[PDB]
Design a protein around this ligand. Structure first.
Ligand code: AGS
Ligand code: AGS
Ligand code: AGS
Ligand code: AGS
Ligand code: AGS
Lengths: 506, 621, 239, 114
């Protein structure tokens, strides 16, 4: 009855149908079972990266126990989920934690091998209650005899930081490795989890939406792991669509709030006894009217659509992927294809001449939004060089303006300070153990956030002929690794190198 | 009777046949006895690594006392197992623990030395206070209580060696780990206790393999411990199979069930795109039902016309563990290994001298012929640019793991200065980034079966070579934490660009100028790639067009290329100085630019087929 | 001495009949101690820093069981401050560690292997040694031995050793070989070149026997409990 | 042994006062010997009703501890340290050790039978 005080119950929740389905992963569950049913030292430990699904395997084992797909050794075993945080709740005296742990262990032992423990995130068990090294290793005798079974799950680097330090206790566990599935497996997972979300948000989810999520979040979001960064997209898309079913849709809800703000500002600018603000006021009114125009247009078009968007599609997923990690991944929704056909005449407003270069850049920008370019390579890697005062830096500053509407949004590095070899450690960072190490790289950290900039290497020929070598990977694919060992991807940038070799020969 | 409350009874447990047998280890038990039977300070401490057997020595001594094989100074004793965890249990008030401990010590002293106290993991004795575990030195230093202990090799140094006045009173007994032919005897002695728990039979041919295999594959753990686990898991799996049904029929039906469940939800889709994903799921479901039928029909013949763990279930266990494939080429893998330079020829055209040498090192490693302590292959291939030497390393890792992102890839253009060696070996203790390990080390330690690609190796500083000097030819690299990592199952690959057109020796007398002889001697074949003939480019064209078409299928959009254009591209793939990269840019310039200009100006939609043809000079869609 | 001659092999052979186990020697690879601060890696960190309880790496293995064999591979690749610790290890017999303890080396057997010169006849190697190490360091050692180089006669016996080792390896499946004397003479004459030592012989044994054997072994027809003979062709040798 | 069952609020100090008064009642005969005296710093939750007795020359308090625990538990209480005269005991040499073994041989000869 101490278990009832310091533990939840997982098989009960699996019986009441409160656990999500578990699809696939038969090998891992079979190995967990056959390690859980041996003579001595029957303690498995799921281990892997954060997100691949480890608690899911244990909940699948619980559902499988409830159903009856387990061998004869594991019938009616009543998994229990311990909680060490509630066991150290109030134990300020000398033995209050020890006696609780002894009570729980004796209760687990009094059953004839029925209870199966489950300590999630078992790296929190090492220094459980300390003051000397006494507690957290009272289970050490029962672990070796195989009296408590103790399924547990930790990440892959919180395991070597806390447990592999204590090789006397690391011996009692058997490691089960859980690697992340592929896209064809994430699709099968999504196809089975697409009912709880359909019910929670009163919407319907197309199958092409699932396929598009599993495909897009594997090439665009590279910081997380697969079975989870694909469910996040579907969840956010469904929640957005349900928010829109509340009568107003999007792109009317923003224009309304914008016109309201414009009106509040114009009503306060009217009582200004000046002359400098009499010219600013005559512009805000024009803006207000030109916005009221399109507001009324949208309001009328909504009526046509409503009299004469109920499911999530393969483009709401792209809308989410574009809202987060602002790379544009949509499908050229007719408001920007005209701009993308006008690109050359729009860049010809700031750079005059050099049609051969304007067209060569515009083609590369255009055939990336049409899905023709190679998905694993930078969207463009150009080096244009000529005489001085011609426009080869003006073009790079005009492309950034055309794309992001702020010339200060590109990552410019001036390659005339990289005169000596050792300056390379500026854009890649210092190795472990040296002075500037927590700061990491500069190019690396600048592209790791906002991975959609334009990168400009001004005057590439004035650097040492060893900085060109760190670019062989950045140019052939998008990878460059800093001192911490994390790789950033340059597959969404445009790399530009300006130079002046052979000043004006031919 | 304060002993009965805070202690079990090892000798009692031994008299009821509840302990496991103890085989061998005579010197250690004799030293324990002869230390336990002296005048003053008679209390030993077994010390060693975790898993070598130190509780087993105390249990064997208890069984020996019960039998009667001890000197007369030690007969008819009782070995009581003290337990400090339940003496601190309820001790809120300020005298309860001290009073309990004093009562227990007085109970031990009121005897006539007819009690041997056994504290296991006695590094847990220095605390317990809040002056505790420190009121025991008087009786310790005189021999009033005979204390047999056991701790690991570095909890001693960490907790007890801090209190040099206390560790004067202990007599260390060093317990080292046994060898393979000792583990075999231990397993032969222990077998009959697992044979009964799992109602199966265990073969001596399996007991030998469980000690031989676990000694070369599982290196983070110690002996007998890591050899009993294989036997236990093999027995448990065999019992699971002796129950309802075998394996690889359980997988097939469990997969067919899910396939049917998904097909019964893909049929009711009002989509034109989702109509072609239903046409492949059905095909795969049929192919799986066919295999299920075949296996289920053969099971009947097997059951009409696998009852003991042989030497192959041990290998199956040690292969599920650690991921390394150690089997016997079960008739479905050998057919695939015999066609390897044809599965590599689907991605790398030409370079047969280098494809017929990478695949020649996997055969003689699956067939159990290669040297068991050296990497499975460590060879450097180099040639001109754009030829396919980084593509072979990515096309080999693509069919061993079925995912080419499952290989450890480090780019050696960033190792320009010598102090960048710390990036892949870690920092020594005391410095900034230390509790993170190496970067090459901590990746081959979690999955010791990848392939390692050192790319552009001659761009590095000529000291990273010296760091690589032991990884080759020995398969071992030690990091800052003092862990040895074994590169004995990896396939090391070093690409380079020296010579760059030199015929045979101008590219070979350039290696011998940058690398040292002690480094060129650790390598296998140094494979020289060759230029690309015009005849082996009309196939690279087909590969590029297939990749482009597969890239366009996301849009339901095909394109039909006619032979005149398909060989116009090959004839403008030129300049045998830049390899096969100009062709990648030519395909873009010719097709993709105008294709993507049409694709967003209307004029082309999904489902269309866009025929390409050769205008007198250019290509027109 | 030169490369591939047997100077790393003699350490593993000496530590194999003193302790009856080849893995019973303390071996550290000196090609990883290229910087100053990596001395703390084999002596431990001072008290109160990140890695403290872990102790040293050379120290913590000799402090317990102080009767081992210590091997320092490629000692020249280290930084000329690691030599300043072996300095007091020699001629006194003990060094101190991060804590302050003084473990004693008065029972070990230190061995240091190198490749200095590698092309000098007999004196350029000593010149390189005297230029790379200090005289008060060379003064403490015992004989600075110099290996010589394999002769065409000291190689047939190595062929025999390698073939016995191969047989012992593929005896876990009852697959003994049967080598002829012309075969052994061919294997001994083919791979000899006196600049790369005895590793060419290993690679030749692999490429000549193991490739054919593994091609025949997983295509049936060479089933277990069998003895295949090896014999010589005009150029290659056939199974 | 003094700290046991002394769970009430007025017990341990009362015991210590009784002991100290029993010592002081005897004129100067009793000589207290506290082994490993670095454990008298805590013991309260006390163990400090000894500075007066030490000031008034009533107690004798011959004690023995190791080197480091001296400076780790006592020299942080320089009020106490002044009341203590240190004697340094060094380890003998091989000759003195042979002398000691020659005198102790008799008892190990009779405990065993050799
Ligand atoms: N095989 C699977 N079947 C169904 N859902 C799955 C499967 N694998 C993962 N998921 C889901 O994907 C998400 C993964 O969550 P968890 O597995 O609980 O994360 P985790 O593996 O515990 O990682 P941490 O480090 O513990 S937070 C959950 O929403 C699961 O329901
Ligand atoms: N084609 C052009 N159209 C408009 N302004 C131009 C053009 N070419 C040059 N300019 C002007 O010249 C200024 C400087 O030219 P830049 O292109 O910045 O020099 P540059 O091309 O970088 O040559 P170097 O080698 O770097 S000095 C710009 O700020 C523009 O004002
Ligand atoms: N000599 C031996 N004879 C029989 N079984 C042995 C022997 N040595 C070890 N074993 C078994 O191998 C396993 C090793 O377990 P233990 O000896 O209890 O480990 P340990 O020595 O206590 O090390 P730690 O630090 O306590 S985990 C147990 O299953 C023992 O029964
Ligand atoms: N033999 C080949 N078969 C197929 N594709 C090839 C071949 N050779 C080159 N390629 C193509 O060339 C591109 C990259 O070739 P790589 O092998 O990476 O160049 P490389 O061999 O690494 O030369 P360097 O020195 O590294 S630039 C890819 O698109 C490959 O498909
Ligand atoms: N005298 C020898 N007898 C038998 N095998 C030898 C002999 N010399 C070398 N070998 C073989 O050569 C290989 C190891 O050579 P090593 O002596 O380790 O190289 P080394 O002497 O350390 O020279 P370096 O500088 O390390 S390349 C093993 O395969 C040995 O069998």
């Amino acid at each position: 009855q101490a278990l009832q005080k310091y533990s939840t119950d997982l098989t009960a929740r699996a019986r009441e149908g409160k656990l999500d389905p578990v699809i696939g992963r038969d090998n891992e569950i079979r190995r967990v079972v056959q390690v859980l049913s041996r003579r001595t030292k029957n303690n498995p430990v799921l281990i892997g990266e954060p997100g691949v699904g480890k608690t899911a395997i244990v909940e699948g084992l619980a559902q499988r126990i409830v159903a009856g797909d387990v061998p004869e050794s594991l019938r009616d075993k009543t998994i229990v989920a311990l909680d060490l945080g509630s066991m150290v709740a109030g134990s300020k005296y000398r033995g209050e934690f020890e006696e609780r742990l002894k009570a729980v262990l004796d209760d687990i032992k009094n059953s004839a091998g029925q209870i199966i423990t489950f300590i999630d995130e078992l790296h929190t068990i090492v220094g459980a209650g300390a003051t000397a090294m006494d507690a957290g290793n009272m289970i050490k005798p029962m672990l070796a005899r195989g009296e408590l079974r103790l399924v547990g799950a930790t990440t892959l680097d919180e395991y070597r930081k806390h447990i592999e330090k204590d090789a006397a206790l690391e011996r009692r566990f058997q490691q089960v490795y859980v690697g992340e599935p592929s896209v064809e497996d994430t699709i099968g997972i999504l196809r089975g989890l697409k009912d709880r979300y359909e019910v929670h948000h009163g919407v319907r989810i197309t199958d092409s939406a699932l396929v598009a999520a599993a495909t897009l979040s594997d090439r665009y979001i590279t910081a997380r792991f697969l079975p989870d960064k694909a469910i996040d997209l579907v969840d956010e898309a469904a929640s957005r669509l349900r928010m829109e079913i509340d009568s107003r849709p999007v792109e009317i809800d923003e224009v309304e709030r914008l016109v309201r703000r414009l009106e509040i500002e114009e009503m306060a600018l009217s009582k200004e006894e000046d002359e400098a603000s009499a010219e600013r006021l005559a512009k805000l009114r024009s803006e207000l009217a030109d916005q009221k125009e399109k507001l009324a247009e949208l309001t009328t078009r909504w009526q046509n659509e409503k009299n004469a968007k109920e499911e999530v599609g393969p483009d709401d997923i792209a809308d989410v992927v574009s809202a987060w990690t602002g790379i544009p991944a949509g499908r050229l929704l007719e408001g920007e294809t005209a701009k993308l056909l006008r690109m050359e005449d729009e860049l010809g407003k700031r750079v005059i001449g050099q049609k051969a270069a304007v067209t060569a850049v515009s083609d590369a920008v255009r055939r990336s939004r049409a899905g023709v370019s190679d998905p694993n390579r930078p969207t463009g890697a150009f080096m244009f060089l000529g005489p001085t005062g011609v426009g080869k830096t003006e073009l790079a500053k005009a492309l950034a303006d055309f794309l992001f509407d702020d010339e200060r949004a590109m990552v410019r590095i001036d390659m005339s300070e990289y005169g000596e070899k050792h300056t390379v450690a500026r854009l890649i960072g210092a190795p472990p153990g040296y002075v500037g190490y927590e700061a990491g790289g500069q190019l690396t950290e600048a592209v790791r956030r906002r991975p959609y900039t334009v990168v400009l290497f001004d005057e590439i020929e004035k650097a040492h002929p060893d900085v060109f070598d760190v670019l062989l990977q950045v140019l052939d694919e998008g990878r460059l690794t800093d001192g911490h060992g994390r790789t950033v991807d340059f597959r969404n940038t445009i790399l530009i190198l300006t130079s002046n070799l052979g000043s004006g020969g031919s | 009777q304060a002993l009965q409350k805070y202690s079990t009874d090892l000798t009692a447990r031994a008299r009821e046949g509840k302990l496991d047998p103890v085989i061998g280890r005579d010197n250690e038990i004799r030293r324990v006895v002869q230390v336990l039977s002296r005048r003053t300070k008679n209390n030993p401490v077994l010390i060693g690594e975790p898993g070598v057997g130190k509780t087993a020595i105390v249990e064997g001594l208890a069984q020996r006392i019960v039998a009667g094989d001890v000197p007369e100074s030690l007969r008819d004793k009782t070995i009581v197992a003290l337990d400090l965890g339940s003496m601190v249990a309820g001790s809120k008030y300020r005298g309860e623990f001290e009073e309990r401990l004093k009562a227990v010590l007085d109970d031990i002293k009121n005897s006539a030395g007819q009690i041997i106290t056994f504290i296991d993991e006695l590094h847990t004795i220095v605390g317990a206070g809040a002056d505790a575990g420190n009121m025991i030195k008087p009786m310790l230093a005189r021999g009033e209580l005979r204390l047999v202990g056991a701790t690991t090799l570095d909890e001693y140094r960490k907790h007890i060696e801090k209190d040099a006045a206390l560790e004067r009173r202990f007599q260390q007994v060093y317990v080292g780990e046994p060898s393979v032919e000792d583990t075999i005897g231990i397993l032969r002695g222990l077998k009959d206790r697992y044979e009964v728990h799992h109602g199966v039979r265990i073969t001596d041919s399996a007991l030998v393999a469980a000690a031989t295999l676990s000694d070369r594959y599982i290196t983070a753990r110690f002996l007998p411990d890591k050899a009993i686990d294989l036997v236990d898991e093999a027995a448990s799996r065999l019992r699971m199979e002796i129950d309802s049904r075998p394996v690889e029929i359980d997988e097939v039906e469990r997969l067919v069930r899910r396939l049917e469940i998904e097909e019964m939800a893909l049929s009711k889709e009002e989509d034109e795109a989702s109509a072609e994903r239903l046409a492949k799921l059905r095909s795969e479901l049929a192919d799986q039902k066919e295999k299920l039928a075949e296996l289920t029909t053969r099971w009947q013949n097997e059951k009409n016309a696998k009852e003991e763990v042989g030497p192959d279930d041990i290998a199956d266990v040690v292969s599920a563990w650690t991921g390394i494939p150690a089997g016997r080429l079960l008739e479905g893998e050998t057919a695939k290994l015999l066609r390897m330079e044809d599965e590599l020829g689907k991605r790398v055209i030409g370079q047969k001298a280098a494809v017929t040498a990478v695949s020649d090192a996997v055969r003689r490693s699956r067939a159990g012929v290669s040297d068991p302590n050296r990497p499975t292959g460590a060879f450097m291939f180099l040639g001109p640019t754009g030829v396919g030497k980084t593509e072979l390393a990515k096309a080999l890792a693509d069919f061993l793991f079925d995912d080419e992102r499952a290989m450890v890839r480090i780019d050696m253009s960033e190792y320009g200065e010598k102090h960048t060696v710390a990036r892949l070996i870690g920092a020594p203790p005391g410095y900034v980034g230390y509790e993170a390990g190496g970067q090459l080390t901590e990746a081959v330690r979690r999955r010791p079966y990848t392939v390692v690609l050192f790319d552009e190796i001659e761009k590095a500083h000529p000291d990273v070579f010296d760091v690589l000097l032991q990884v080759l030819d020995e398969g071992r690299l030690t990091d800052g934490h003092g862990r040895t990592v074994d590169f004995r199952n990896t396939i090391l690959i070093l690409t380079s660009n020296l010579g760059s057109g030199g015929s045979a020796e101008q590219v070979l007398a350039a290696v011998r100028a940058t690398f040292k002889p002690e480094f060129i001697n650790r390598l296998d074949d140094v494979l020289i790639f060759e230029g690309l003939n015009p005849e082996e480019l009309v196939r690279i064209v087909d590969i590029q067009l297939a990749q482009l078409g597969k890239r366009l299928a996301q849009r339901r959009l095909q394109l039909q290329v006619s032979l005149p254009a398909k060989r116009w591209l090959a004839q403008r793939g030129f300049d045998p100085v830049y390899g096969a990269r100009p062709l990648r840019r030519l395909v873009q310039q010719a097709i993709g630019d105008q294709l993507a200009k049409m694709l967003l100006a209307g004029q082309v939609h999904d489902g269309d087929t866009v025929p390409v043809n050769v205008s007198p000079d250019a290509d027109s869609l």
